[PDB]
Ligand binder design. Structure first.
Ligand SMILES: Cc1cc2cc3c(=O)[nH]c(=O)nc-3n(C[C@H](O)[C@H](O)[C@H](O)COP(=O)(O)O)c2cc1C
Ligand SMILES: Cc1cc2cc3c(=O)[nH]c(=O)nc-3n(C[C@H](O)[C@H](O)[C@H](O)COP(=O)(O)O)c2cc1C
Ligand SMILES: Cc1cc2cc3c(=O)[nH]c(=O)nc-3n(C[C@H](O)[C@H](O)[C@H](O)COP(=O)(O)O)c2cc1C
Ligand SMILES: Cc1cc2cc3c(=O)[nH]c(=O)nc-3n(C[C@H](O)[C@H](O)[C@H](O)COP(=O)(O)O)c2cc1C
Ligand SMILES: [Mg+2]
Ligand SMILES: [Mg+2]
Ligand SMILES: [Mg+2]
Ligand SMILES: [Mg+2]
Lengths: 332, 332, 332, 332
């Protein structure tokens, strides 16, 4: 594999069509799914030359701990759909690569088992029927050693996935929600913040004032995201709001972005627009489907090479330097 | 049916080619027909998160009465072209869905029969040979219980529909103007306003100063519209003038928009740009052609689901909240 | 024929490939040829409603005389290439339609014969080897009753027409320059202006300061034009400079435009951007090739219908009103 | 050959696929390779008319010597890959055309042999393992009569060429680096500047502040360049930074540009945006592959004709006049 696109082709060959569609699809007409890619393709980096690259490092510190790259594995539900080892294979490869792994509320292996793999597990929360149940899930994650609560804030309910409807897609009987919903509000965020010492990261912020309010609410970070184009069809890509959001928060929390990251060059674009780090979703599942744990390992080593390559070619010895790069919008 | 596009495919299968062309076509090169879709596809919504959605409602008040959605059925002439029950089937489904139905001057069933269906009938007016005849038609509509006069202001004459010319399209002998023209002016608007207590709504406004003059003329509303790309080929899409027009009228009348609305997400875009409500034309006729009254019912229930879905995903418990959403233009 | 595109298809059927290529082609990569069309397709008109259309007229006064439309036939060389009657057929149809006809310096019938047809002949000048010969040609045109000198200013030499090179295209022996070159300068313009009482119109102006200098030089008009994309490959379309040029000349001369006018809607766009009138080139030759004089007659009657249709739909009872229309750029 | 594209077609026919791919390819997804062309295609020139063209000249003075065109042959490694005579054939044709030729550090014929051809040889430098070796290479070039040191500053290491990886491309045993690396810094630039009296030209500058720093560092010129899209995938095209860079340097050094120059019209665009001269890479190799020295001669004579044609059509008797042309961005 020399690009992430090699992995998509491999995953399409192996997966049943309806499972590939569950993974690949978005809501509605898939306008936001496509726009995530269009937006990145419009961004061009203005690289710097002739800087000291004797000690190029892709490492960052985030939520109190080092990560080997400015990247984490995005929460993706039901990973046993893609490979029999599911979440354990992905978490093992992420741990070995020094990349945080986001455990899902809807994981097909229990959060305690995934956390036992080690590494830097984060936990993604969906708000449950009642506050007590929701906070018990947060407590389980904390007790198991998860290092951040990634509270998904863009799913009052799941969006309308037309591929799944047309396929009549249902979970196989051999895939379950191994950890076992009502719309979250700012009051829910406060309940979580008051119930944990872990950083709370709000995933799915797109409006500038919601980013500001996230800081005021005590969030340790946000993920600027349209949920991979799976929620509101027509929601702006996170990458298009990122610069405005970074300016408005003015360092008050970590600002991550996701949606359509498909190369180290895309990571560089995200950092040049101001992101602290990115999440990567579908490509990790392509690698899992294609070759299990070893596939994910190969994907992460390819991304690490691409990130180092892009940073050095752009004159950046550190991720902080990459955040100071300028960009110019073009046409594609 | 999981999208409005399912209905177009069904209607193309059943309708004779020349009738499908009468419905689908625009004037000239169809530049304005295509631009109605292009314009909507360029708009992206910036959704809000974490708001109270316990009582999400898609209802609005317009022209003194509640509507179940921020939408009405646009005036489309000669509905018996598409199904034997024609206007009665559409009006029955609209009534049952709580959506206003616009009766045409060129309806293939008399306006009194359509009004007798019940619901919230509006009446669309074309200006006739002389003021007296025009005002008699307005009086008939009022006597029959129509709740608004939708005065079409963009048809001094009908545009040049090249599909119809190439097809030699003519009305079948079994379709007639069951209610049975000169260019309307501002004097005609005043004659109507002085002759009825019903709200007068000017359909086909695109220039900002025409919207302002509409308010000054006593209009209760306007429809910002290029007539579905059927009138001036090269006329700007209504959606592209909507924001400027909403600012200029500053609440002095209701501001509706039409042209290319094909999903609840498109309704959300229109409201985020400032519209009070939208009209929907061709998709209603697709549903009528595909399955008569039940087809229209299914279309309206699908649109209701899509509107509720889009509003909630965007953090809007009411249409008023949706009007306060921000947007960002993208590339497609 | 219901559109000008019908005529292109007819002309392609009848003409030898190398002659069609001589007519259709541009210089270099044909970037400016294509851009003439792209530019018009990006312009949208903001029509006005409810205005008095009792006496809609497409007539204008230009260079002292009435024209039936805001249009003239552009100078196109060697019209016998397209039909045996060549320039006489086109001039007869133009006369009958009330449209000025531009006689070429490189006409395949003598300018005196074409002028004898009557109508409103203009004469297009290429600067010749020496001032004396050039001025004799101007004097011939004036003596024959031509009403304006259209001095082509964008041909210091002919551009590089790759279709013609690849075809090895040469004039047939039966086509000659029946009136029988050095680069023109501002001194040449002054020599012409001092030698005739006819209005001098500079064809091929694109730079704002060249338009201003044209007024200062005593020109009665300019044609904002990239020569149909046949001269500098990469020259901006005239339609894209028109608004800036109209503002800079501030009524000091007539401002015409050409390049890619293919419908009455395109004429409306040009006038809304500020043009006094347009020239039309290739479509007139398509009509000539397809059906001789009667073909040109049909083209001009179609254009007249389209211009009247577009003006009325846009609320314009006169061309002056159309010049006051606003426009909005879109995407295509 | 009537366009540079004729030469690409000829080269694709003759070269082995993997060698054509080495020449044609870029890094990553080839976004920057494509953008070099997209950017030029968006630029339109505003030509001037009626200027004195009695003595049109395409000559410039650069680095102390006359050149026949505002163009030089870009450094392209291993020219024996494309033709048995390799660099000698290209240098001979460049000399005969009056165009400077850039000798590569990775040339397949020694720099002394290429310099012995005569003409105006420049020397492109890659920074070597240590300062002493690097400066010895500079000294060799100076001793051999090279007239400028083109220090490549955008290659801390070579980019990731996916075509080469997928082809498993390797140099044939019959091609070697006949002159026989560590990342260059500003200290390396200073070491070169202090070690030679020749002008030092920094190739691969894209950031405005790097252009300013180049002037402050004593560079005699810069090449605004993304290395033909072969280095950072996603780097902005040089043509898009050129105007801003020309303004910032305010005549303090020569400002060249490269990337996607494919015609004399493209040369005109580059000069109108402010470039002193362009480099041309791939097309020179197409000509070499197609027909050796005579092929390169034909390419350079075609480019000379196209440059003269474009300049005159735009009203420019000199390259300085072309730099004063204005431009307008369009859509393609
Ligand atoms: C099959 C699938 C399931 C989930 C389940 C979740 C989830 O239970 N909670 C959550 O908070 N985000 C989810 N996501 C979104 C994900 O976390 C990233 O937001 C996007 O995948 C980023 O885009 P790509 O990198 O995929 O473009 C999913 C994405 C995909 C494709
Ligand atoms: C076949 C057909 C007949 C009519 C007859 C009328 C009419 O006698 N009076 C009027 O005032 N508007 C009409 N219209 C325009 C319509 O009311 C809406 O303006 C558009 O259809 C909105 O666009 P879509 O929702 O269709 O894109 C029509 C549209 C179509 C397609
Ligand atoms: C075959 C052909 C010959 C000529 C000869 C001349 C000419 O001896 N003098 C002149 O001054 N302009 C010419 N022109 C340009 C023409 O007058 C109009 O500028 C464009 O044709 C407008 O574009 P379309 O309406 O054609 O797009 C020509 C255009 C075409 C196609
Ligand atoms: C096969 C190939 C080898 C080299 C080797 C070098 C090099 O050892 N040093 C350097 O400094 N630039 C190089 N280049 C870039 C070149 O000098 C021009 O920057 C681009 O080719 C301009 O774009 P095109 O005119 O090619 O679009 C190369 C370009 C190509 C295609
Ligand atoms: Mg991503
Ligand atoms: Mg609509
Ligand atoms: Mg024209
Ligand atoms: Mg180049």
């Amino acid at each position: 594999y020399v690009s992430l696109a090699d992995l998509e082709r491999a995953a399409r060959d192996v997966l049943p069509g309806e499972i590939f569609d569950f993974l690949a699809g978005g809501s509605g007409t898939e306008a936001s799914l496509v726009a995530n890619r269009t937006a990145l393709e419009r961004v061009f980096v203005i690289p710097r030359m002739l800087r000291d690259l004797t000690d190029v490092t892709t490492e960052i510190d985030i939520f109190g701990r080092r990560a080997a790259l400015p990247m984490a594995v995005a929460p993706v539900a039901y990973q046993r759909l893609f490979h029999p080892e599911g979440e354990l294979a992905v978490a093992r490869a992420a741990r070995d690569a020094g990349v945080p792994y986001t455990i899902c509320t809807l994981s097909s292996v229990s959060l305690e088992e995934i956390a036992a793999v080690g590494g830097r597990p984060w936990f993604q929360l969906f708000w449950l029927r009642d506050e007590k149940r929701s906070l018990d899930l947060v407590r389980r994650a904390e007790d198991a050693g998860c290092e951040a609560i990634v509270f998904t804030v863009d799913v009052p309910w799941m969006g309308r996935r037309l591929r799944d409807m047309r396929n009549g897609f249902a979970l196989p009987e051999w895939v379950t929600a191994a950890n076992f919903f009502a719309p979250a509000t700012w009051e829910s965020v406060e309940a979580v913040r008051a119930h944990t010492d872990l950083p709370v990261v709000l995933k799915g912020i797109l409006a500038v004032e919601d980013a500001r309010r996230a800081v005021d609410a005590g969030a340790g970070g946000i993920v600027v995201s349209n949920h991979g184009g799976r929620q509101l069809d027509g929601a702006v890509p996170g990458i298009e709001m990122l610069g405005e959001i970074v300016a408005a928060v003015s360092g008050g929390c970590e600002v991550l972005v996701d949606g359509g990251i498909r190369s180290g060059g895309d990571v560089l674009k995200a950092t040049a627009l101001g992101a602290s780090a990115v999440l990567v979703g579908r490509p990790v599942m392509w690698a899992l489907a294609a070759a299990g744990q070893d596939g994910v390992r190969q994907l992460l080593e390819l991304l690490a090479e691409e990130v180092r390559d892009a940073m050095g070619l752009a004159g950046c010895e550190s991720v902080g330097a990459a955040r100071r790069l300028n960009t110019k919008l073009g046409v594609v």
